[PDB]
Homo-oligomer: A and B are copies of this chain.
Amino acid sequence: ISLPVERLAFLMAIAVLNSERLDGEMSEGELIDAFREVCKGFEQTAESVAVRANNAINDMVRQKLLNRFTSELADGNAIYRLTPLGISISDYYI
């Protein structure tokens, strides 16, 4: 369990979008967009946007924060969902 400010903010944005998502599904094509926006707000460019986004998504997935599902038809060919621990961490503040 290690959530820097950017990762935590990305998680909160993801939760907000899921709340405003119609059917409660999140393809990675939108996760990357959310990460782009949060990193832009936080004003830091260690590497490219894509590599940082991929690393962060993988880190949360392995940190038991997101669940990934392989769906070719989905935008980005994957569907992501908040895990119960991620839900708890997000709603702890929300």
Contacts and interface: CB of A to CB of B under 8 A. Distances in A.
Copies of this protein in the assembly total 2
Contacts of A8: 1
A3 interface: yes
A2 interface: yes
Contacts of A2: 1
Interface in A1-30: 1-3, 8
Contacts of A3: 1
Nearest to A7: B1
Contacts of A1: 1-3, 8
A9 to B, nearest CB: 13
Nearest to A3: B1
Most chain B Cβ neighbours within 10 Å, of A1, A3, A8: A1
Interface of A: 1-3, 8
The 4 lowest CB-CB distance pairs between A and B, nearest first, are A1-B3, A1-B1, A1-B2, A1-B8
